[PDB]
DNA sequence: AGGTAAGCTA
RNA sequence: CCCCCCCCCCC
DNA sequence: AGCTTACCTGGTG
């Protein structure tokens, strides 16, 4: 459905802003790393999660 | 093109992370052992340190890299002139044999000619700079 | 890819395929999916031989 | 966890901190070697209060360390975030070094409070050439000495 | 650290104690040279290194097309002309801080909100 | 026997602490005779802690000194000590609770953040 | 107090486990003797300073009436604790003679850190009597108490004979327990002895296996 | 790929000659603290010397190839951050048109 | 290439 | 040297 | 102790 496609695209779009936000959060050093993880290892886990939640 | 001298030069960083006296030695073709870089430079005619150090670390401010080279100076300290350096690459028979290896087999690209010790020195120096840059996580 | 700017941690740069198979993949989406797909074929060949011996 | 402490999160935290491996390297910023000749005083004015608290009173059998120690100083700077993170005292850390090298290493430290976290170490000479000996002792210190935890147990995570 | 060489043979200078006057000297082990030490510091370790972050900031940094651009005003000249990179320290742990170079004054500044940095 | 010599030097720096720390009370809303007497009320108070039932102590003297000395953030807490705040509980206090309210700001922000990242 | 408290706990924890093992081994020990509380242990085996006096801890254990029926030749046991972290050859001889004179069947030596290679050589020196060595640390936790550790039962020579008859077995054909195995050590298994292992089964509920010592 | 080609191998000496004629100081006479910013110039992994204004040099070479004067198959890179200029006459390099 | 388990050189 | 088979599946 | 070194590595046509 055309309406279903809109709902899909916005779902991807919001996950993309969500991701941009956590990227801005990490660039301003306001990001705190999870146990046994690089600040970067942490960020990537968050990003991957956001996108995989999105495709589902 | 020309004979195809497939000789690969290895410049090794001995000692591991958080290990006392991290020395640097290079493996030359037709010489069993890995010679400490400082000797290879003195064999090339670059005799003082800070002239050998000048060829490796270009910024005379990078204290990190310079302290990374203090052990190399100690390892090489035992030799002080070109003869003593050519001889370590072995009498009279060994000194002559050494000159030949450094001329035709050590860094054969660049030249296999003769009087290009400075051109091959700065190159070895470039390798050691590149080695230490990765070791210091840069 | 040489089409991207340096230090780009975005969904697009790091390989997010936003598009469906019906809509079709962009050249970039196509190439990342191409790398992802290649990985699969390798651990297929690998697992096929490893798993075989395990049985023996 | 013990049958009676199944939901006690504090019991979990307490074991977690007691089992996880922690080395002196984990809390060190940088190590340094200085020529500080008279041990009864200091060239570094930053440490003026460090000598004024411990080299001070006591005085636990003064000269105590014979004071005929070593002119070569080994100085370690510890990370405030990392110390509090793994929950450690300057006194705790100091006692681990003091107990590792026994009486052949005179140790002092800046207090938890102080703007800078410092551990001052001097070799104990019985009755020339020491520069190498300190680089040997700092390599031991960082790579060896365990401050907290069980060896091999590297990362410890809580779970409900 | 920042060490010297022997004027006379340019060789490395090794430490030595003048026990009589309680001062440090640096001697040449290839000749009879000696000189008073400048600082009491001899060796510096550094486990957590922060030097190698702003590496390769040549004045031609702007002429790299691969480098991205931002519209953040300069904290010294106030220009919305920047070329930005990430920490050149090629260590695993390294934070994702951004270093901005002005293309109207050639001065570096970060997006870091945890520290009041001037390097 | 040797303990007495050690215990004497302990009270000595407490009066030193109470002579150049007692000034910010008079400089901002609260002489050496008051210090010596008040400094004694810690030496034997901390002695109740060590050699229990039947080593720790010396390190607890330094913690008491360095922190109560601090100022101008820790003098606001040191003001409470001279103006009715347990001189009995402050001896067996010893930890991060002695530290600056400015230091405690960051210590609280830190601790509560570790717990979020290792609770998985 | 500091870290004296932890050493006292550990030593008492290991004392319990020794008593647990001695009881399980056949010998007469009460659950009251076993479940002895820490405050009582302190008040019995610690000096004026409240510091552990191991020499006092050493005890004698005699087989139960039940044990006498299965293994008639099972004699009495002696358990010794030493206050020397490194147990010297001069101390080991003192122990060996105790077992020989009082004609003990088994002797167990609980040590702190080590026993001299000199001392550990005069161990098989007094047959038919047998000497055992346990590090205090290994005894802190009773491994037999674990989830994964099923009940092992030492079989009589007659019980072993029967197993072999009833399955038409040669000793080679039985599954094997290693002599140095924690449970083999706990029960003081000698080579050739058989252990009946009764474990729970997701298929049958209860399954009995057997292992012979090596 | 359809539009990809592989370098046949060209002559380095004309580029080497052009370079030294365009501000390339020889390696034989380099003094690192005298020329600290200096960009390292490599013709087929052979370090030849250093150049003081790499920006203008790079332009000249690029304009030379585009015109035809430097063979089109010859690869030339300027790693501004690493202070390096690598050039390849080299046979075997895989290339694509853009 | 890779994990092992003999086998033995400084 | 190819061929062969290349299940399943994010929720 | 830490070098070296032989042993194997899916199926059919
Ligand atoms: Zn000299
Ligand atoms: Zn600017």
From Swiss-Prot, chain A:
Its biological purpose: DNA-dependent RNA polymerase catalyzes the transcription of DNA into RNA using the four ribonucleoside triphosphates as substrates. Largest and catalytic component of RNA polymerase II which synthesizes mRNA precursors and many functional non-coding RNAs. Forms the polymerase active center together with the second largest subunit. Pol II is the central component of the basal RNA polymerase II transcription machinery. During a transcription cycle, Pol II, general transcription factors and the Mediator complex assemble as the preinitiation complex (PIC) at the promoter.
Annotated crosslink Glycyl lysine isopeptide (Lys-Gly) (interchain with G-Cter in ubiquitin) location: 24
The encoding gene: RPO21
Modification(s) after translation: The tandem 7 residues repeats in the C-terminal domain (CTD) can be highly phosphorylated. The phosphorylation activates Pol II. Phosphorylation occurs mainly at residues 'Ser-2' and 'Ser-5' of the heptapeptide repeat. The phosphorylated form of Pol II appears to carry, on average, one phosphate per repeat. The phosphorylation state is believed to result from the balanced action of site-specific CTD kinases and phosphatases, and a 'CTD code' that specifies the position of Pol II within the transcription cycle has been proposed.
Signal peptide location: none
Protein family according to the UniProt entry: Belongs to the RNA polymerase beta' chain family.
Native organism: Saccharomyces cerevisiae (strain ATCC 204508 / S288c) (Baker's yeast)
Subcellular location(s) per record: Nucleus
UniProtKB/Swiss-Prot annotation, chain E:
Domain of life from the UniProt record: Eukaryota
Function: DNA-dependent RNA polymerase catalyzes the transcription of DNA into RNA using the four ribonucleoside triphosphates as substrates. Component of RNA polymerase II which synthesizes mRNA precursors and many functional non-coding RNAs. Pol II is the central component of the basal RNA polymerase II transcription machinery. It is composed of mobile elements that move relative to each other. RPB9 is part of the upper jaw surrounding the central large cleft and thought to grab the incoming DNA template. Involved in the regulation of transcription elongation.
Note: Present with 2440 molecules/cell in log phase SD medium.
Family stated for the protein in its record: Belongs to the archaeal RpoM/eukaryotic RPA12/RPB9/RPC11 RNA polymerase family.
UniProt-annotated binding residues for Zn(2+) 1: 6, 9, 28, 31
Species of the source: Saccharomyces cerevisiae (strain ATCC 204508 / S288c) (Baker's yeast)
InterPro entries attached to this UniProt entry: DNA-dir_RNA_pol-M_15_CS, Rpa12/Rpb9/Rpc10/TFS, Zn_ribbon_RPB9, Zn_ribbon_RPB9_C, Znf_TFIIS
Modification Phosphoserine, positions: 39
Entries under SMART domains matching the protein: RPOL9, ZnF_C2C2
Positions bound to Zn(2+) 2: 74, 77, 102, 105
Any single biological process term in GO: RNA-templated transcription
Quaternary structure annotation from Swiss-Prot or TrEMBL: Component of the RNA polymerase II (Pol II) complex consisting of 12 subunits.
A Pfam short name: Zn_ribbon_RPB9
Zn finger region (C4-type): 6-31
Annotated compartments: Nucleus, Nucleolus
Zinc finger boundaries on the chain: TFIIS-type: 70-110
Main localisation: nucleus
Keyword match 4Fe-4S: no
Keywords: DNA damage, DNA repair, DNA-directed RNA polymerase, Metal-binding, Nucleus, Phosphoprotein, Transcription, Zinc, Zinc-finger
Protein name listed in UniProt: DNA-directed RNA polymerase II subunit RPB9
An example Gene Ontology CC term for this record: nucleolus
UniProtKB/Swiss-Prot annotation, chain F:
Domain of life: Eukaryota
Species name: Saccharomyces cerevisiae (strain ATCC 204508 / S288c)
Record's protein name: Transcription factor BYE1
Gene Ontology biological process: DNA-templated transcription; negative regulation of transcription by RNA polymerase II; regulation of transcription by RNA polymerase II
Compartmental location: Nucleus
Keywords, ordered alphabetically: Metal-binding, Nucleus, Phosphoprotein, Repressor, Transcription, Transcription regulation, Zinc, Zinc-finger
GO MF term set: chromatin binding; methylated histone binding; zinc ion binding
Anything else known: Present with 892 molecules/cell in log phase SD medium.
Any single Gene Ontology cellular-component annotation: nucleus
Swiss-Prot record, chain H:
UniProt subcellular location: Nucleus
Protein's job: DNA-dependent RNA polymerase catalyzes the transcription of DNA into RNA using the four ribonucleoside triphosphates as substrates. Second largest component of RNA polymerases II which synthesizes mRNA precursors and many functional non-coding RNAs. Proposed to contribute to the polymerase catalytic activity and forms the polymerase active center together with the largest subunit. Pol II is the central component of the basal RNA polymerase II transcription machinery.
Oligomeric and partner information: Component of the RNA polymerase II (Pol II) complex consisting of 12 subunits.
Other known facts: The binding of ribonucleoside triphosphate to the RNA polymerase II transcribing complex probably involves a two-step mechanism. The initial binding seems to occur at the entry (E) site and involves a magnesium ion coordinated by three conserved aspartate residues of the two largest RNA Pol II subunits.
Similarity comment: family membership: Belongs to the RNA polymerase beta chain family.
Protein name per UniProt: DNA-directed RNA polymerase II subunit RPB2
Organism the protein comes from: Saccharomyces cerevisiae (strain ATCC 204508 / S288c)
